[PDB]
Amino acid sequence: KPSVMGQTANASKNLKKTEKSSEEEIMNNNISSAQIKDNNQSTTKDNNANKKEGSEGKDYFTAKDVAIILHDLGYVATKAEIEQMIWEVDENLDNKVNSYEFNLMYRRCRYDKTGLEPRNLYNLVQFLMYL
């Protein structure tokens, strides 16, 4: 169920955000929230993220690796759109994806109030942790 799952999470979010709107229809901040967000045994996520994405292993992650992972997943690698998947969460330096940036994104998207932040890149992290 490789593509249909990225479609599930998508459609669930599409309904979730409609209900989030319904809620209002009826009736150092970054780090201070990061530290408290989920601190589960993320050695699974770290070892898995390096095992599936981190090839060279120097705190650096590009679009070529995500493109080849997408193609290996039997997915139709859109030639240039994967750049947006790399970019949507890049906040310090455009074309800089650090392991610390994985921590920040993973964590802000894992434990938060609403979500909606990208809803579209860490779905792949959810997939790799899923299988």
Cβ distance 100 to 90 under 8 Å? no
Residue with tokens 């045994």: 41
Residue with tokens 């993220």: 49
Interatomic CA distance for residues 112 and 36, integer angstroms = 10
Cβ distance 98 to 60 under 8 Å? yes
Cβ distance 32 to 107 under 8 Å? no
For the chain, give the longest Cα–Cα distance. Answer: 52
Interatomic CA distance for residues 105 and 121, integer angstroms = 9
Phi, psi (rounded to 5 degrees) for 91:
-120, -25
